[PDB]
């Protein structure tokens, strides 16, 4: 029960193909079916298909959504799932979970935290990183809202905090948007004390080891 | 296969109400229905099973019934937590299939937004690259139009953004991008944030600046 862990690449070009791997802690492994269940953002989650107990010889159904191209495994040594991906299309981009299926409680009693699969033969590009102050004659209050343009990046997703965590007051990141081809995003923050504080965004983009500090 | 409809998609109701939630198999499914519990940016969680049984941990204000095509989910009284999309699971066959699932939004007292203007940085610039950015923030409904105009003339090539409703005080923001090659950033003068809020106000919302500045 206690934790169920998925790893695994995340940006792959058409036609390529991937496995995910999931761990698990805290339960034995081996006396639990195990499932893969995959989510689209925006929309549903759609299960995928399951490796048996060890009981029940460790045999895999497969939704026919996939069948075919999807292949499930154990490694009942370490505590180890897997999920072999194969032909990657378009639209297998999703976020995908292991999760335990259990007994009464289930199935899915117990799920991971996820990992996205971007499918798509665009490369991995840092993103560039403004500032966002109050600008040409512009009044204001005595508290400022302030921002972070975080510019043509790719692939998702990008981290953005505020005077490293310790001003998470009022914080906003908008979610990112498609231009072009590349992802665009937004964060705004608010100041009392604007001016003589020091307000800086850290964002940080993993898919290409990117952190940066911008000081407004 | 057995496809799965949930009713109603979106859903807002007051905290300390009484939710409803439908599912609607296409196949007697008997007893073997679920109900997950998935709140923003987390996986999807385990509220009941097999129509009625809530999972261990979890509060007694939510409970199923329904049996065969119809199900519900019912929350007697909505908590602010409990502010999140909630899944339907028929497993009587395989493949399993989940519902379309819910939204449920918290609702409150109207708000007017809190309009934010910002030219470009001099950075961005000196990569000749423009960015014009409008923050609309912490508002309430949720619907809400923002419109760009250089000099006085409505404007597109444009990118809109929203949050999800706020765990802290149930607000919606809105961000807002005018990207501009530098040359035309620089013929022009006027850049202006104009919102709607189909409530709060009339007059609507005009933030603007002058690049040569005031």
């Known amino acids: 029960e206690v934790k169920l862990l998925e790893s695994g690449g995340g940006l792959v070009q058409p036609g390529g193909s991937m496995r995910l791997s999931c761990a698990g802690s805290?339960?034995?492994?081996?006396?639990?079916?195990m499932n893969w269940i995959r989510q689209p953002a925006g929309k549903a989650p759609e299960w995928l298909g399951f490796?048996?107990?060890?009981?029940?010889?460790?045999?895999?159904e497969y939704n026919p959504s996939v069948k075919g191209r999807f292949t499930i495994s154990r490694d009942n040594t370490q505590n180890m799932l897997y999920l072999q991906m194969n032909t990657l299309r378009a639209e297998d981009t999703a976020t995908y979970y292991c999760?335990?299926?259990?007994?009464?409680?289930?199935?899915?009693?117990?799920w991971g935290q996820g990992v996205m699969v971007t499918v798509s033969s665009a490369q991995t590009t840092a993103p560039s990183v403004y500032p966002l102050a109050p600008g040409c004659g512009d009044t204001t209050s005595s508290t400022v809202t302030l921002g972070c343009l975080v510019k043509g990046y790719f692939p998702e997703p990008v981290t953005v905090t505020w005077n490293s965590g310790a001003l998470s007051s009022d914080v906003h990141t908008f979610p990112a948007v498609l231009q072009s081809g590349l992802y665009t995003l937004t964060s705004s923050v608010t100041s009392s004390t604007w001016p003589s504080q020091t307000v800086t965004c850290n964002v940080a983009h993993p898919a290409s080891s990117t952190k940066v500090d911008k000081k407004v | 296969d057995i496809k799965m409809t949930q009713s109603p998609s979106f859903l807002s109701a007051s905290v300390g109400d009484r939710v409803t939630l439908n599912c609607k198999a296409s196949?007697?499914?008997?007893?073997?229905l679920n109900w997950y519990q998935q709140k923003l940016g987390e996986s999807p969680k385990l509220l009941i099973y097999?129509?009625?049984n809530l999972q261990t941990g979890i509060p007694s204000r939510f409970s199923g019934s329904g049996s065969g095509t119809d199900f519900t989910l019912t929350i007697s009284s909505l908590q602010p937590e409990d502010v999140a999309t909630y899944f339907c699971?028929?497993?009587?066959?395989?493949?399993?299939?989940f519902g379309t699932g819910t939204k449920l939004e918290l609702k409150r007292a109207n708000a007017a937004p809190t309009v934010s203007i910002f030219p470009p940085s001099t950075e961005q610039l000196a990569t000749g690259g423009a960015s014009v950015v409008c923050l609309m923030n912490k508002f309430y409904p949720r619907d809400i139009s923002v419109k760009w105009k250089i000099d006085g003339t409505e404007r597109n090539g444009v990118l809109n953004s929203v949050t999800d409703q706020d765990s802290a005080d149930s607000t919606y923001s809105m961000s807002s991008t005018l990207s501009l090659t530098k040359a035309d950033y620089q013929s022009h003068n006027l850049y202006t944030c104009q919102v709607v809020h189909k409530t709060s106000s009339s007059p609507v919302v005009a933030k603007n600046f002058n690049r040569n500045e005031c």
């Open positions: 999760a335990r299926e259990g007994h009464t409680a289930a199935p899915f009693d117990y």
């Open positions: 805290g339960f034995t492994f081996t006396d639990f079916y």
């Open positions: 490796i048996r107990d060890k009981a029940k010889g460790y045999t895999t």
């Open positions: 196949q007697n499914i008997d007893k073997y």
């Open positions: 097999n129509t009625n």
């Open positions: 699971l028929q497993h009587i066959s395989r493949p399993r299939t």
